[PDB]
Design a protein around this ligand. Structure first.
Ligand code: DGD
Ligand code: CLA
Ligand code: CLA
Ligand code: CLA
Ligand code: CLA
Ligand code: CLA
Ligand code: LHG
Ligand code: LHG
Ligand code: BCR
Ligand code: BCR
Ligand code: BCR
Ligand code: PLM
Ligand code: CL
Ligand code: FE2
Lengths: 341, 324, 30, 436, 35, 35, 81, 33, 37, 33
């Protein structure tokens, strides 16, 4: 039939784990990203790039292990194993942070492969590909944060390191240096995520509490048949309840589920746009009118000015250890303190 | 009938545009009072000496704030946990200067939101519904109680409650991280898993239902017009959605039961937010997150830093700047 | 004019709440 | 295997205890076995704590929460909270472990071997949830038992060796309470006080005379109410006000227990009388005021303030803790506040020792039991027992409020008959007129 | 006549949702526009 | 200050009594199914 | 469904446990010998607990040049040696 | 406060131009039958 | 410390408080024996 | 019932390094520090 057709029938054959054409990209890249993260968090140090212990072998735990970013002097090098920095030596490649770029690149291509898998399975099953559309938002977040943000900055060093406490450091870094909470794009991201969690909880509870009595048991879960044509819950009763409780209610189930798609996806896309702005240090750090007012009036104090003071404290107290390549030596008298304010 | 039966039939009437109920006869005045006081304080409240050291913090729009930086400042540190109504102050100027509006708003709001939960139960009872939507609502309500009441009680002052403003909320977050290391607390990590998973499963469920909508329209009209309000047949093919999701991961990871799926959708963020509200309360009694400072020591005794040590450095930086 | 703008947008939002609740298009069964 | 599967009972395995609702014998077995579990934890935890107890060191420095409870009762302790002997702790643990074996035997027997329903065997023990008179009779029996327990605490206080009084002069001692507060005005004025700062409701009880008198009142009231409920049936307003079913009674108890858990959290956080700082450690306000007083005597060999209502108090952020009252501080506090000259030339060595020791043990710590600020190294292992008790009981009280909401809603829905869902042919909203 | 022209519709719910989106976005971004 | 305190006490007492006596006025009977 | 033997059949089979009573201990002992003999430190370049700092210095051995970072790491490893 | 003055017109246009658009569409939807 | 004659049973005491938790696990074990019917 | 299936490959590429890593991490737990 042609080798392409026979391969195509083999790749899309029904089995426990679907492979597909997208599997050739997805499974190696996702497997390598996950295996690289486990290998780095189990064995690989960050001593030469960050001056940190970040592996189980050094004594860290699950919260504190990380595959750390390469050193700042690497720039935006791809840090290939055969590249001019590692020169084929696996040990120096691990010591220089090459595992970070390994995980980031293989994870990016794995996310591409997973989204192509969503498209392929939607094509063969025969459904509309809205799951792939929704998955565009995690891809936007990953590309903006792990790729676009370090590319706009000086090096891969300032990207998040793949770890729990390292991600917490990334959060605190963005607060101290970018004032990322003040950014309206992050605000829309927070609204999208919290509204998505609210929509998930409220829709699940509403469906579970407007169920039709379709079985004699007191456990209602067995009163549902997958092949049934009737609705399992009363949309009219749910609409009446939320109309009288909240004032407004969904009356279209299709619009409800599209809205559940729309809210967190739009939030994540907005946060990705803000992260691109932060990649160029185009931050909503300050309001100029309040800066001028605070400069001309020493008694003017709002929560925004206190947040600026807290950000200054974060920067000065964390910069010498979080940015060890800069050789920041801050004497005690230049460190901002509240009791000297 | 007498006036009491007519009033009781009006209060519990399901024909009202908004249901009142008995929880509503408490809820409406308290929430109206809190809303009116919040709007007036957010626009025009004078600066509040929140720390009791005669250094007032201006939170209202008229005193040089925008929407982002505006807040209702929490009551004074000199007030502490003392009940501070209007009549307990010598003058309205003293009540405003010590942060009395914050106490009025938060007490009225907490009472009104508890009665909102009760009203949700009440309407579910009047409509012949199952009653557990209020249980789901108990998670954000627990969070509001944690940040407005329980954390002040544990720390000993309503001055440590969360301000009623955007930048004030960020200040509350940063000072809380400085004092308690909330990011390293597993209850907050469960809360983050709850909200991230809730957003994920919300997008997932929406995309899978939207993906499997049954063709009832044309390309020139919106697909939402394929559903009629109150139609008996299901508007999407749950079997096709299950087949897609089972092929996406594997067959045993997909819900074939819509009731089980919707229970999971309810349960995941509600349990996560329960745990994060309980985390805020337990850190109010100073049971803080994991420290892990100096957890790696070399053979010669020198401390080898981890990412937790960088976090502790940042926390110390916030700590030295929020005090005095 | 800044405070006026914020209060005006907030008042428009509250008026929109009123119209969305009490002057909505009614949901009709079937 | 009657009612032990979903088809016969209607409840899945994860709600399998709901199959016990109309099986009085097996339900009684579950209750007795659970009570055995509770007594087993009490005995085993007391034995564990005693096995790891150093009597010379303070109890709150070793993470104990059960030995302080026995010590507050005046068992095995002397002046200043010093442990004169540890044998009564061992007796309490061993007797609880043995009694738990007995209760476990009874629970296993009634759950496994005994009659499934108690109705046909005994008219006295057999009960139906809808029978309001039998429910009130059982409630009356349990109220009498609870009143007897309160009077047992009273008997321990007045006759069998007394209680540890932290307010006893000299630094606290075991004292026999001979003059309890029987006056209803004080006892119910504790009930009528505000729950806010400076008032503190029943948490602000600051002497054992009030505690013993309140327990006399509570025991007598519980015995009288138990007799009242044995002798009477519920009135018409009560029968029209409540749902009368097992899940409804469970939901009422859950709401009560949630409120009690919140009250116990506030008791263990604020009260230093029934939770003496000798055993439980200082409270948060206590530690802050101890820090202020100790740094004052340091700097005089700090700062003072004036308070919103005009009282001499410690200055600083600890102005929020000016309502604190402690046995080591009341000798120094005068009419208008902390008498500064009386700090200078009336200070006693035990008061300074208490203040410094309570400085070093402020109720601040981490989940991995690291003491001090969250920004400090792990060189001190101390989380206060007050913190553990308050946090755990807030968590339990909140979850029991959630359980009360769940079971109250389910009981109302099941009594009204729509707990299994909306009837398709009789959907109530369809009959209702449209809102607009 | 062009046979590809089709009527455009916006129901009242979409009007309310769009007005809410526009007004909330304006309330969010007005402080940054004024700066 | 004292007049305001009396007014607030009267208002709160009125609403709380409305709540308590309303839930005592045959509230379990007000369902759509069994009573 | 899909024509694969179910996991419940295999994990309850005698022969599966016969095979997996040998392979799993062999892999576990392979990992244990990887760490305990110290091969992991050499393979991944992770410093030993006495190899973070040189005996004379207390400076963290950061790499500072892009194209000489390999020689820099080797110089640090020589000076600790 | 010393704000950017153009923010005013910016905010007004940000309110006016889209909302008007929606209003136009809504009104012409109501006149169709 | 415990009284000295009991000290030989000190390890047993060290595991006694954990026993109720196992009871909870035992219920699931029992359900696993009956197929979660 | 074949044995060398796609499911076998996925399970074992996730299972063999998992046990190797678990043995490595336990041997790490017995490092003298
Ligand atoms: C049905 C219920 C009806 C309810 C409707 C509304 C009626 C009132 C509600 C009460 C709300 C309480 C708010 C303030 C509680 C507080 O400041 O609590 C603390 C007080 C104790 O007060 C403190 O009490 C202290 C008493 O100690 C004093 O006395 C001691 C004696 O040893 C010591 O000497 C000590 O040093 C000395 O200061 C001091 O006076 C302090 O200043 C004072 O603040 O607790 C107390 O009064 C007792 C316990 C309070 C209850 C806990 C509240 C729970 C709320 C969360 C629920 C979750 C919701 C989830 C929804 C989803
Ligand atoms: C889905 C498959 C897949 C994909 C997309 C990638 C993708 C990538 N891998 Mg990768 N990898 C894979 C599977 C995959 N890998 C597998 C299975 C292994 C295990 C063996 C590895 C092991 C591995 C290592 C060890 C490293 C990478 C690296 C990389 C990155 C750079 C590689 C590069 O420049 O090659 C470019 C080469 C090609 C794109 C091949 C193109 C072939 C053309 C079209 C044909 C013409 C070639 C011609 C015939 C040859 C003549 C040559 C002659 C003139 C001399 C990139 C993101 C590096 C990395 O991440 O650095 C941080 C790195 O160091 N990979
Ligand atoms: C405090 C915990 C507790 C208690 C006391 C009970 C008690 C009971 N459950 Mg139960 N259950 C629990 C937790 C508990 N459950 C949990 C957590 C779950 C969820 C998994 C369930 C799920 C569940 C289901 C699904 C069902 C029950 C049922 C029952 C009842 C009959 C038991 C029976 O026939 O089993 C027989 C089991 C055995 C004979 C196995 C041995 C069990 C023995 C008693 C253990 C004793 C060990 C102990 C060390 C002995 C000390 C003795 C010493 C003092 C001398 C019984 C009253 C059934 C019921 O309602 O009956 C109508 C039923 O169908 N339960
Ligand atoms: C005195 C307290 C009390 C009593 C007697 C009951 C009794 C009952 N409840 Mg209930 N409940 C309570 C408190 C109580 N509840 C609280 C506080 C909550 C809030 C969390 C709930 C929430 C609740 C729900 C949501 C439901 C019930 C249900 C039921 C019925 C069946 C229960 C069953 O088989 O569980 C079987 C037990 C289990 C499956 C075990 C659960 C495991 C827990 C949740 C985790 C424990 C974690 C532990 C503390 C730490 C880790 C341990 C370690 C080993 C890992 C039964 C009448 C069911 C019902 O309505 O039936 C009519 C039902 O669906 N309950
Ligand atoms: C809540 C507790 C409780 C309750 C209500 C019951 C109820 C019952 N049991 Mg039972 N039982 C219990 C606990 C309980 N038991 C315990 C803990 C054990 C283990 C020792 C047993 C062992 C047991 C057996 C072996 C048998 C029963 C039987 C019976 C039934 C008839 C008993 C009778 O006629 O008594 C008549 C009244 C008396 C004999 C007087 C009892 C006086 C008591 C012992 C004095 C207690 C003093 C004080 C309250 C102690 C406080 C302890 C507390 C703080 C923990 C009845 C339904 C019988 C049965 O099922 O019939 C078929 C039966 O054969 N029970
Ligand atoms: C475990 C304890 C317990 C329980 C469950 C019951 C249960 C019951 N009792 Mg009861 N009783 C008890 C102990 C108990 N009793 C004791 C110890 C006494 C002696 C003082 C009495 C004396 C007694 C009498 C004289 C009567 C009852 C009645 C009733 C029934 C109606 C309950 C009702 O509507 O009141 C609910 C409570 C109220 C309506 C009170 C008003 C609610 C206020 C506003 C709440 C205020 C509390 C608030 C939350 C703040 C807390 C602090 C506060 C102290 C300031 C019910 C079966 C009645 C009945 O039917 O008799 C058969 C009746 O007439 N009881
Ligand atoms: C504990 C919380 C119990 C789950 C409820 C949480 C969301 C409720 C709010 C929305 C209402 C949602 C709603 O209305 O749900 C209703 C849903 C189905 O109702 P049914 O009436 O069929 O069943 C409930 C009873 O009637 C019993 O038959 O109930 C359940 O599934 C309860 C399951 C109990 C399972 C026992 C405890 C399981 C533990 C959960 C995980 C614990 C581990 C945590 C790790 C961090
Ligand atoms: C006494 C009880 C308490 C009363 C509380 C009143 C709350 C009012 C709720 C909002 C009403 C306005 C909704 C307009 C929009 C409107 O009328 O929508 C009504 C719409 C009805 O949907 P249908 O299914 O009928 O529409 C189907 C198709 O026509 C789609 O176009 O509902 C939704 O789409 C719900 C999702 C949006 C929910 C928006 C909630 C946002 C809350 C507030 C956020 C901004 C706050 C800013 C602060 C300054
Ligand atoms: C990098 C690299 C590579 C790769 C490799 C790989 C691919 C590996 C893999 C690896 C792996 C693949 C590993 C694994 C691991 C695993 C582990 C280590 C596990 C762990 C686990 C645990 C610990 C558990 C946990 C849990 C959960 C989660 C839940 C429940 C509970 C518990 C806790 C039990 C190559 C050579 C190609 C090239 C060069 C570079
Ligand atoms: C029904 C049921 C159940 C339950 C059960 C229970 C809950 C039981 C209980 C039980 C119990 C509750 C038990 C107890 C036991 C105990 C014992 C048996 C003890 C003994 C003791 C002894 C022997 C002692 C000893 C000693 C002393 C003398 C002192 C010193 C130390 C020592 C320890 C050495 C379940 C869930 C499973 C499920 C199904 C069925
Ligand atoms: C021992 C003691 C004492 C004493 C105490 C006392 C004397 C107590 C009593 C107490 C009491 C005497 C209590 C009572 C309570 C009550 C309650 C808590 C109530 C509740 C109620 C309810 C729950 C109701 C409900 C309702 C409504 C509202 C409407 C209609 C429907 C119903 C019926 C559901 C003192 C502090 C001096 C000192 C320390 C110790
Ligand atoms: C409608 C609700 C808002 C009510 C706010 C009322 C504020 C009244 C303030 C009056 C203060 C007058 C003091 C007179 C002397 C005194 O008794 O202290
Ligand atoms: Cl601050
Ligand atoms: Fe849905």
């Amino acid at each position: 039939r042609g080798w392409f057709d026979i391969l195509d029938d083999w790749l899309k054959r029904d089995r426990f784990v679907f492979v597909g054409w997208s599997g050739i990209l997805l499974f190696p890249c996702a497997y390598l990203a996950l295996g690289g993260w486990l290998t780095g968090t189990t064995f690989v140090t960050s001593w030469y790039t960050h001056g940190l212990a970040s592996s189980y072998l050094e004594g860290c735990n699950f919260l504190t292990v990380a595959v750390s970013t390469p050193a700042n002097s690497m720039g935006h090098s791809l840090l290939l194993l055969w590249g001019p920095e590692a020169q084929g030596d696996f040990t120096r490649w691990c010591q220089l942070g090459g595992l970070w770029t390994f995980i980031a690149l293989h994870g990016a291509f794995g996310l591409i492969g997973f989204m192509l898998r969503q498209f392929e399975i939607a094509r063969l099953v025969g459904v509309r590909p809205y799951n792939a559309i929704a998955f565009s938002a995690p891809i936007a977040v990953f590309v903006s944060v792990f790729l676009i943000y370090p590319l706009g900055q000086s090096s891969w060093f300032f990207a998040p390191s793949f770890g729990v406490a390292a991600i917490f450091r990334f959060l605190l870094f963005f607060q101290g240096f970018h004032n990322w909470t003040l950014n309206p794009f992050h605000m829309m991201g927070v609204a999208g995520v919290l509204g998505g969690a609210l929509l998930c909880a409220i829709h699940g509870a509403t469906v579970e509490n407007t169920l039709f009595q379709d079985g004699e048991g007191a456990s209602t879960f067995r009163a549902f048949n997958p092949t049934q044509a009737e609705e399992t819950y009363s949309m009219v009763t749910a609409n009446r309840f939320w109309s009288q409780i909240f004032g407004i209610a969904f009356s279209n189930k299709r619009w409800l589920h599209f809205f559940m798609l729309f809210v967190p996806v739009t939030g994540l896309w907005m946060s990705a746009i803000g992260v691109v702005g932060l990649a160029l240090n185009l931050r909503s750090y300050d309001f100029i009118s309040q800066e001028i007012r605070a400069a001309e009036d020493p008694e003017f104090e709002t929560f925004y000015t206190k947040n600026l003071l807290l950000n200054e404290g974060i920067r000065a107290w964390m910069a010498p250890q979080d940015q060890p390549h800069e050789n920041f030596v801050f004497p005690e008298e230049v460190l901002p303190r509240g009791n000297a304010l | 009938a007498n006036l009491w039966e007519r009033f009781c039939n009006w209060v519990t009437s399901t024909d009202n545009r908004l249901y009142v109920g008995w929880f509503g006869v408490i809820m409406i005045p308290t929430l109206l009072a809190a809303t009116i006081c919040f709007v007036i304080a957010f626009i025009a409240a004078p600066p509040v000496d929140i720390d009791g050291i005669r250094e007032p913090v201006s939170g209202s729009l008229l005193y040089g704030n925008n929407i982002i930086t505006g807040a209702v400042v929490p009551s004074s540190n000199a007030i502490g946990l003392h009940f501070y109504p209007i009549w307990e102050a010598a003058s309205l100027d003293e009540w405003l200067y010590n942060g009395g509006p914050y106490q009025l708003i938060i007490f009225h709001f907490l009472l009104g939101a508890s009665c909102y939960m009760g009203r949700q139960w009440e309407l579910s009872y009047r409509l012949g519904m199952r009653p557990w939507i209020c249980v789901a609502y108990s998670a954000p309500l627990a969070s509001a109680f944690a940040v407005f009441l329980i954390y002040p009680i544990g720390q000993g002052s309503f001055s440590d409650g969360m301000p009623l403003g955007i930048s004030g909320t960020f200040n509350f977050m940063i000072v809380f991280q400085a004092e308690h290391n909330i990011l390293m607390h597993p209850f907050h990590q469960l809360g983050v898993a709850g909200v991230f998973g809730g957003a994920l499963f919300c997008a997932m469920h929406g995309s899978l239902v939207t993906s499997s909508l049954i063709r009832e329209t044309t390309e020139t009209e919106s697909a939402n017009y394929g559903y009629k309000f109150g139609q008996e047949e299901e508007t999407y093919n749950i079997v096709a959605a299950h087949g897609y999701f089972g092929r996406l991961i594997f067959q045993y990871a997909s819900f074939n039961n819509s009731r089980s799926l919707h229970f999971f959708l309810a349960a995941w963020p509600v349990v996560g937010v329960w745990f994060t509200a309980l985390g805020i309360s337990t850190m109010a009694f100073n049971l803080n997150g994991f420290n892990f400072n100096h957890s790696v020591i070399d053979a010669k005794g020198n401390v080898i830093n981890t990412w937790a040590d960088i976090i502790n450095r940042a926390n110390l930086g916030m700590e030295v700047m929020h005090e005095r | 004019m800044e405070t006026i703008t914020y209060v005006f947008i907030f008042a428009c939002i509250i008026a929109l709440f009123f119209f969305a609740i009490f002057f909505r298009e009614p949901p009709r069964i079937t | 295997a009657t009612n032990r599967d979903q088809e016969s009972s209607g409840f899945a395995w994860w709600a399998g205890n709901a199959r016990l609702i109309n099986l009085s014998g097996k339900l009684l077995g579950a209750h007795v076995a659970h009570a055995g579990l509770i007594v087993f934890w009490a005995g085993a935890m007391t034995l564990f704590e005693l096995a790891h107890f150093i009597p010379e060191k303070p109890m709150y420095e070793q993470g104990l929460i059960l030995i302080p409870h026995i010590a507050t009762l005046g068992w095995g302790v002397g002046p200043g909270g010093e442990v004169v002997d540890t044998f009564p702790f061992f007796v309490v643990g061993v007797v609880h472990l043995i009694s738990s074996a007995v209760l476990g035997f009874g629970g296993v027997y009634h759950a496994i071997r005994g009659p499934e329903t108690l109705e046909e065997y005994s008219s006295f023990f057999g009960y139906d949830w809808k029978d309001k008179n039998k429910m009130t009779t059982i409630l009356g029996f349990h109220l009498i038992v609870l009143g007897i327990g309160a009077l047992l605490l009273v008997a321990k206080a007045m006759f069998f060796g007394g209680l540890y009084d932290t307010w006893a002069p000299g630094g606290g001692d075991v004292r026999v309470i001979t003059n309890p507060t029987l006056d209803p005005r004080v006892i119910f004025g504790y009930l009528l006080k505000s729950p806010f700062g400076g008032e503190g409701w029943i948490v602000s009880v600051n002497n054992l005379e009030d505690v013993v008198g309140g327990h006399i009142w509570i025991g007598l009231i519980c015995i009288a109410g138990g007799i009242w409920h044995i002798l009477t049936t519920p009135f018409g307003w009560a029968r029209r006000a409540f749902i009368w079913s097992g899940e409804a009674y469970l939901s009422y108890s859950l709401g009560a227990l949630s409120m009690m858990g919140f009250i116990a959290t506030c008791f263990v956080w604020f009260n230093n009388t029934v939770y003496p700082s000798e055993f439980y450690g200082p409270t948060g306000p206590e530690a802050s005021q101890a820090q202020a007083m100790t740094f004052l005597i340091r700097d005089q060999k700090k700062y003072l303030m004036r308070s919103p209502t005009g009282e001499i108090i410690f200055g600083g952020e600890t102005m929020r803790f000016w309502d604190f009252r402690g046995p080591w501080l009341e000798p120094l506090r005068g009419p208008n506040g902390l008498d500064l000259n009386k700090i200078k030339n009336d200070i006693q060595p035990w008061q300074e020792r208490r203040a410094a020791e309570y400085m070093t043990h402020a109720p601040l710590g981490s989940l991995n039991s690291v003491g001090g600020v969250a920004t400090e190294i792990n060189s001190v292992n101390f989380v206060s027992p007050r913190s553990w008790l308050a946090t755990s009981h807030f968590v339990l009280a909140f979850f029991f409020l959630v359980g009360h909401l769940w079971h109250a809603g389910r009981a109302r829905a099941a009594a009204a008959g729509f707990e299994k869902g909306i009837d398709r042919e009789s959907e109530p909203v369809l009959s209702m007129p449209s809102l607009d | 006549p062009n046979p590809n022209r089709q009527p455009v519709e916006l129901n009242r719910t979409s009007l309310y949702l769009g007005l809410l989106l526009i007004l909330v976005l304006a309330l969010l971004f007005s402080s940054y526009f004024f700066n | 200050m004292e007049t305001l305190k009396i007014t607030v006490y009267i208002v709160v007492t009125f609403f709380v009594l409305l709540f308590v006596f309303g839930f005592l006025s045959g509230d379990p009977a007000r369902n759509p199914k069994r009573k | 469904t899909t024509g694969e033997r179910p996991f419940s059949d295999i994990i309850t089979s005698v022969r599966y446990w016969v095979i997996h009573s040998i392979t799993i201990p062999a892999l576990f002992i392979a990992g244990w010998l990887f760490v305990s003999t110290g091969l992991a430190y050499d393979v991944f370049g992770t410093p030993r607990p006495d190899s973070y700092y040189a005996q004379e210095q207390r400076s963290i051995p950061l790499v500072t040049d892009r194209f000489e970072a390999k020689q820099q790491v080797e110089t640090f490893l020589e000076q600790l040696k | 406060m010393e704000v950017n003055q153009l923010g005013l017109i910016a905010t007004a246009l940000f309110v006016l131009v889209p909302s008007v658009f929606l209003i136009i569409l809504y009104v012409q939807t109501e006149s169709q039958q | 410390k415990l009284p000295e004659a009991y000290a030989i049973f000190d390890p047993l005491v060290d595991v006694l408080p954990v026993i109720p938790v196992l009871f909870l696990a035992l219920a699931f074990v029992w359900q696993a024996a009956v197929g979660f019917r | 019932y074949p044995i060398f299936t796609v499911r076998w490959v996925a399970v074992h590429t996730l299972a063999v390094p998992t046990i190797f890593f678990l043995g490595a991490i336990a041997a790490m737990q017995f490092i003298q520090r």
